[model samples]
Target: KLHKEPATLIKAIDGDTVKLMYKGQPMTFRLLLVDTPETKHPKKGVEKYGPEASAFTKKMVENAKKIEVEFDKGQRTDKYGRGLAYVYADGKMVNEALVRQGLAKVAYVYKPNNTHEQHLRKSEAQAKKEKLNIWS
Candidate 1:
């Protein structure tokens, strides 16, 4: 009924990014509707709460019973060839998980992805009061 598909988890690159297989094709994905801190490489960029988000993302990916991708109707892919989609793991949205844990901030707003904006925002608000992850 909607534009979503079950995917095989290849990797959770950071709080807001992942690489996975969808439709028998392996590709990179930019998690839709949420933004998290950066995860640095040795010779490049870094941020204060980056590792915290990354570790949390990685740990969740590793433990999920299943993961899937859900694309926004307004936009399907980013300039980097990454499919923009929401992630679901064990029946929960990983997008909101990050927001609820204060690891990601909602961004890349658009009518399509806004399907989750308010929910994530509410979750973020609650997490913010508790000072978790990026909110710390």
Candidate 2:
């Protein structure tokens, strides 16, 4: 089961997290099935390639005319309390786009919630093969 809603992108907090407004309420969504380097870490500081990942995400979301968020089946939120979602901008899956572009890596695999794991993995593999962005 999946739930979908229209959202106004507030900003891209990082490669995986984005701030958006849904139903007139502000929310932070952690992109599902992908993770990028930390541009702002609590202890490790900025990791290598972090800034580039963040910039790529920012440009993607900021350029979109509309954004949509889809909540996964099982758990809807992560341990950190952020909503876990697959974001889409202009009909493109933003989460998978990051992986396809090689800006992020396919990360955590929470069962049932990973609807796009296969596609994401394939995208990552292609990105790796092509040596795009971070994969380079």
Best model per lDDT: 2
**Tens-digit lDDT track for model 1 on 1-136?**
3566789988778777888988899999888888787865445566767788888778887799888788866778988899988888877888898889888888868776577788888998999999987787
What TM-score does candidate 1 get on C-alpha atoms? 0.89
lDDT of 2 by residue, 1-136 (tens): 6766899988789877899997898888899999888877889978887898888789989999988899888788888889988999888998898898888899979898888899899999999999998878
- Between which residue pairs do clashes occur in model 2? none
Clashes of each: 0, 0
Q: Model 1, stretches more than 4 Å misplaced?
A: 1-3, 41-44
Clashing pairs in 1: none
lDDT, each prediction: 0.82, 0.87
lDDT of 1 at 73: 66
Question: Least accurate stretch of 10 residues (summed lDDT) in model 2?
Answer: 1-10
